[PDB]
Write a protein that binds this ligand. Structure first.
Ligand code: HEM
Ligand code: HEM
Ligand code: NI
Ligand code: NI
Ligand SMILES: [O]
Ligand SMILES: [O]
Lengths: 153, 153
């Protein structure tokens, strides 16, 4: 994964992109299409463009550039925030508390038991299946950080 | 992973949890401790507590239950939001646009060059090292979604 400061580096340069997301988007796609022409053939609405000049002139190529960098920006900002929130918890449970993944499984089953007992109206079979998958994904994230830190959990 | 409706089911039952986080946190730790006595040994503050009635009387156990469900809740809500943002992107690039992972490596290459070219003051060796790793994490997330969908590309 990235460190705390590694994400801050990423978000700082991303702010600069957002000051002219249109121009950045355009240049990224044109650099892609010139360096790797086979990428242009995946785009039914752009593959007619032959020259740099035609590409720079395309209103919709510039609009698509914005759509791509906006979506990627949103994803990176969520990853940064999510990592900063998870890594402290993973570190303390790995190093200080030394909690095996097995014990995270037990507390996952305890949550599902309590939600079945107290909220069956918003916890039918489907919603229970959903929570079981959700808590497994959470354990998997922790297990991934445990490995990064070389704690056998 | 979870479908759109499954994440909504998770968020919907979590809303009920957060409405009585005190009581739910207590019931989760009592269920864990009574089902798996070994887990009580990890808790210096609680390991003397011998019965549900003792555990229910512990103000410390209640406060810890709140800290646990508060931390978990934040992680689940972020995961639901990020997945609902990522899953459609991966779905469309796999099944509609048919974009191999190697082409996301190409566009990552172009994003690095455009950032180095236009914002070098904000894009030194470390900043560029950070962005390179961050774009890898993005491609790995799409790659993990493609594998789920049995798209090789
Ligand atoms: C950082 C990488 C990428 C991001 C964030 C991104 C994002 C997007 C978004 C948000 C859309 C519109 C919604 C959708 O159809 O899912 C889209 C459409 C599309 N993307 Fe991507 N994309 C990326 C990489 C690529 C690459 C490398 C290719 C092809 C070589 C590609 C080909 C397409 C195509 C063909 C469309 C459909 C465009 C249309 O509506 O005519 N994408 N992309
Ligand atoms: C959903 C699972 C879990 C969550 C979200 C969680 C969260 C937390 C948080 C936020 C803290 C306080 C800050 C910290 O030290 O990181 C904490 C402390 C702790 N956790 Fe966990 N925890 C989980 C599972 C477990 C399990 C299963 C055990 C043991 C079986 C455990 C043992 C501890 C201990 C011993 C502490 C320190 C308690 C204290 O000194 O007051 N945790 N946990
Ligand atoms: Ni978002
Ligand atoms: Ni948060
Ligand atoms: O794209
Ligand atoms: O915990």
């Amino acid at each position: 994964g990235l460190s705390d400061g590694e994400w801050q580096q990423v978000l700082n340069v991303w702010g600069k992109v957002e000051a002219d997301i249109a121009g950045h988007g355009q240049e990224v796609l044109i650099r892609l299409f010139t360096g790797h022409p086979e990428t242009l053939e995946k785009f039914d609405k752009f593959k007619h463009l032959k020259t740099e000049a035609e590409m720079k002139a395309s209103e919709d190529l510039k609009k698509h550039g914005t759509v791509v960098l906006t979506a990627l920006g949103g994803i990176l900002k969520h990853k940064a925030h999510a990592e900063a929130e998870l890594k402290p918890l993973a570190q303390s449970h790995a190093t200080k508390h030394k909690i095996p993944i097995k014990y995270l499984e037990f507390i996952s089953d305890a949550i599902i038991h309590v939600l079945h007992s107290k909220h069956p109206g918003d916890f039918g079979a489907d919603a229970q299946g959903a929570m079981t998958k959700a808590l497994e994904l959470f354990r998997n994230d922790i297990a991934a950080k445990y490995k990064e830190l070389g704690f056998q959990g």
